């Protein structure tokens, strides 16, 4: 059996992060905690979620188990859950997931894991640039860029980190030097990405959340967000466009 | 003449509660206070509003009087009124209603009471189950059920009160025991109702408001809400569906 | 060169006030401060904006300069600016405007002032009535009138200031006596105006902002708003309808 208790905000945020890309997903309850990964239909973005066992109020599992979940449903139900509610998830067999919060108990039929798209592999990306900043600040940068173009360039070097967008008659540059960043290795990298996806990624993040960016040149970017008081790690990987 | 003064929130809430079902209504200014009742077009729900004279800041009437009011208009005008404004209602003759608040005076033509649908009678429902709880908690239960089905079962017995909804692959159960409820008589009852109407009823209620449910088996349910600091009694009665 | 620093709220509010009427505008950086005036396409309303140099945190200009600005763009970009951000505007040449706030630098191509509709002249209106009140209160009056009609009468005399609207079966009167107003000269005047424009004007104002109304009979009304902590003067002039 699986029986865990987590804050409502933790469940709502991780559910929202996953459903942003897929409507169904395999959820692994491992000895070390919860894990889930998925790639979107267009194969342009991937999401990797990790909730260490210590981020849960209670984490009791017998054997490690994988369940198939209808993410659209859990997301819909999560909207009736308060961020301040404590939520208990229970799986006694293999066909039903119980979600309890307040005076309510929701029961949803699980999906056969095999019926879900094959479990994707995590790319062993070798990236030279590492940038650590506030997720809210990043979110604002993307929001500003979104008003100028549908594509942005991420650039890193010894002088800092920049996010640039160019339009027909206007342009915008977000720039932070090493001293302004939380952590920065000065690695040299430059890649271009779709603003649409970046904007969607930021919907589960805000001021106070940590963001670690792993960047290369003409390589997918890794955006590692630490959310909900640092209880969850939500990494989004986005394929690159041609930077020239 | 009729001359009363009430809080903006009191007028806004009671107006909203009535217009939810009808666009016109007879408003009775009785020695004991304000009274109004109406049934919706489909004859599926009824609303009974009572504002005791002591809930008003000022309640001065000569003789008991009944006026016909265009509820869509009062509701529209009430949107320009603040919950913290004090509102004065005046009827000097029989054709005009004056609504004063802030530095504004609104005058609306009254409707001939006779032109309005016959005054409905209050059903003398004999119900075995009585449940008293927080209206906000009830509202949340209905909101959760609404995500699962368009119908819900209300069930009461010695073990408490439950609200259940079932879908094709999921279900939800809200349950509170006698100790969790404010007041409960343990009466046995079970009826099914439309979530659409229940959801609409709850729009004028929130955490802190009292709700008394009178329930029977295959009988209309009585939902007595005490709103605006307990100043108004707004009872909604909803016809049942077949529970089996 | 032009180099000024202002609060985000100041830029956002003045930008919104101007774009309400036009999509392009001439902005004058004078020794005494910023000035801009424009009339809408229908020639029914005009806006005159004045930001004294002392309302800026920094105001450094070489020679007085006039620039042409795409107001739709600045407005769009201003949405990514926080009211609490400090914004720096820089014009080093004549073709580019730099907008800096936070860690972002926006560059927009300027418009040739000549390509913009001829600079309008300020009408030397001679009006007998002067009314000073809270802009938020005025805004509420217009909002109330808007529910009754698409036209309102502004009336002033020794007994105070009134805003009246009449519908088929209802009416509304907003009235404030001399003692209730901040300043009032008791001038006699009566004119009728379009609620649509008045409502739009009030979108940049709120409680706490000062409004000085200059009113005549069958003459355009002057609505002088002092916004953003009294840092900006935004005057709207609205052509009259036939009052009878």
């Amino acid at each position: 059996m699986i029986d865990v208790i987590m804050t409502g905000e933790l469940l709502k945020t991780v559910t929202r992060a996953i459903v942003a890309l897929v409507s169904e997903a395999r959820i692994h309850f491992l000895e070390k905690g919860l894990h889930s990964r998925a790639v979107d239909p267009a194969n342009v973005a991937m999401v990797i979620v990790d909730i260490p066992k210590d981020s849960f109020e209670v984490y009791n599992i017998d054997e490690e188990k994988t369940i198939g979940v209808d993410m659209d449903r859990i997301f819909d139900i999560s909207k009736s859950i308060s961020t301040k509610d404590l939520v208990e998830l229970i799986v006694e067999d293999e066909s039903t997931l119980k979600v309890k919060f307040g005076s309510v108990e929701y029961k949803v039929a699980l999906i056969d894991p095999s019926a879900i798209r094959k479990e994707p592999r995590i790319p062993e990306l070798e990236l030279p640039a590492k940038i650590v900043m506030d997720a809210g600040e990043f979110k604002k940068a993307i929001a500003a860029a979104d008003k100028i173009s549908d594509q942005v360039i991420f650039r890193s070097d010894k002088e800092g980190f920049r996010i640039e967008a160019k339009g027909d008659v206007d342009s915008i540059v977000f720039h932070m030097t090493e001293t302004e960043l939380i952590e920065f290795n000065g690695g040299e990298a430059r890649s271009m990405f779709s603003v649409d996806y970046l904007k969607e990624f930021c919907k589960v993040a805000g001021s106070g959340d940590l963001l670690t960016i792993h960047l290369g040149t003409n390589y997918p970017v890794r955006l590692v967000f630490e959310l909900v008081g640092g209880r969850a790690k939500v990494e989004y990987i986005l394929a690159p466009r041609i930077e020239s």
Side-chain angles (χ1 to χ4, degrees), chain A:
Chain A
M1 175 198 259
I2 290 173
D3 181 22
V4 306
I5 297 183
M6 65 205 294
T7 70
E9 179 180 29
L10 183 52
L11 179 53
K12 295 165 68 70
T13 293
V14 173
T15 293
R16 181 174 182 178
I18 296 174
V19 76
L21 298 188
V22 298
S23 62
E24 311 181 310
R26 287 194 191 62
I27 305 303
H28 305 277
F29 284 84
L30 312 175
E31 291 294 352
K32 72 225 88 301
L34 181 157
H35 177 76
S36 186
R37 68 184 76 166
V39 183
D40 76 331
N43 280 272
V44 177
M46 180 186 274
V47 62
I48 306 167
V49 175
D50 283 288
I51 307 181
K53 62 180 181 180
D54 293 317
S55 288
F56 287 86
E57 308 310 317
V58 174
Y59 191 79
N60 299 319
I61 65 169
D62 285 340
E63 69 284 355
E64 301 194 317
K65 182 191 299 176
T66 300
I67 58 173
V69 185
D70 182 324
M71 299 307 289
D72 291 322
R73 288 187 180 295
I74 298 301
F75 182 54
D76 191 38
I77 297 298
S78 71
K79 293 176 179 180
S80 64
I81 300 178
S82 172
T83 58
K84 291 184 173 182
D85 280 338
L86 270 192
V87 189
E88 179 172 27
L89 301 180
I90 301 174
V91 179
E92 310 182 305
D93 42 284
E94 292 183 56
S95 63
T96 306
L97 168 65
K98 293 184 180 179
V99 182
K100 305 198 300 174
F101 59 93
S103 296
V104 171
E105 178 177 300
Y106 170 68
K107 289 182 175 180
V108 62
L110 290 173
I111 302 174
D112 173 41
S114 303
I116 300 180
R117 172 177 175 175
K118 285 291 184 178
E119 194 72 351
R121 292 187 177 183
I122 299 175
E124 292 185 300
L125 294 169
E126 184 74 5
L127 305 182
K130 182 183 176 182
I131 307 103
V132 182
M133 61 185 295
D134 181 82
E137 183 65 3
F138 177 76
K139 184 168 181 170
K140 289 171 179 294
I142 299 304
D146 178 55
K147 288 179 173 55
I148 296 301
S149 179
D150 63 329
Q151 298 175 164
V152 291
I153 290 173
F154 280 14
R155 174 183 168 186
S156 182
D157 60 32
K158 298 183 178 182
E159 288 185 56
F161 177 59
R162 304 193 188 82
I163 292 177
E164 321 178 319
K166 299 182 177 299
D168 288 306
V169 299
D170 51 21
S171 63
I172 193 162
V173 175
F174 163 82
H175 175 215
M176 279 185 76
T177 59
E178 167 175 33
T179 193
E180 295 178 295
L181 296 164
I182 298 174
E183 177 178 346
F184 182 58
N185 77 336
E188 297 187 305
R190 183 185 179 80
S191 291
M192 184 158 249
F193 305 98
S194 154
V195 172
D196 293 312
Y197 276 86
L198 293 172
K199 189 175 181 184
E200 190 61 36
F201 295 163
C202 295
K203 286 180 179 177
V204 297
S207 297
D209 292 317
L210 195 71
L211 167 62
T212 297
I213 304 172
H214 296 280
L215 182 70
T217 294
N218 295 311
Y219 255 152
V221 59
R222 292 179 59 205
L223 301 171
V224 187
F225 294 88
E226 294 183 75
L227 314 172
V228 193
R231 292 186 182 71
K233 177 167 288 187
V234 175
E235 172 177 350
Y236 281 117
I237 300 175
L238 177 59
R241 293 188 179 192
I242 300 299
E243 198 296 303
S244 53

